[PDB]
C-alpha cells in the first residue's frame, strides 16, 4: 500500500533500459545487482553464478526500483567502471 504507491511499476521500455544498464555493469557491481534480485526474490535463491536469469516479470517494483537506483548510480556516474 505504501511501496507501490511510491514506486510505480516499470514499463516495458524501462525494463529494457534496466536490462541494458545491468548489461553495462561489470562483475563487481553485478554482485550487488544479483544481491538485490536474490534478496528481494527468495524464490530466485538458486541463481547459479554461471547462469543467472533476470525475469523482470516476477521482480516486484521494489526490486526494479532498487535495481534501477543502483545501476544508474553506477553507470550515470561511471559509464566505464573498468578500463
Amino acid at each position: 500500500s505504501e511501496e507501490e504507491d511510491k514506486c510505480k511499476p516499470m514499463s516495458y521500455e524501462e525494463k529494457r533500459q534496466l536490462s541494458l544498464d545491468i548489461n553495462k555493469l561489470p562483475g563487481e557491481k553485478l554482485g550487488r545487482v544479483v544481491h538485490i534480485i536474490q534478496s528481494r526474490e527468495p524464490s530466485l535463491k538458486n541463481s547459479n553464478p554461471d547462469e543467472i536469469e533476470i525475469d523482470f516479470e516476477t521482480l516486484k517494483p521494489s526490486t526494479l526500483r532498487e535495481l534501477e537506483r543502483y545501476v544508474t548510480s553506477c553507470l550515470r556516474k561511471k559509464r566505464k567502471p573498468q578500463a
Binding site: 516495458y12 536490462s19 562483475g27 553485478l30 554482485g31 536474490q38 533476470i54 525475469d55 523482470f56
Partner: peptide, 19 residues
C-alpha cells in the same frame, strides 16, 4: 506470452554457491 527482455549473465566469483 509477451516476449520480454529476459536477461542471462555470468557473474565472476560464485559467492552464492548453495550447499
Amino acid at each position: 506470452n509477451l516476449q520480454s527482455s529476459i536477461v542471462k549473465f555470468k557473474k565472476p566469483l560464485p559467492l552464492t554457491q548453495p550447499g
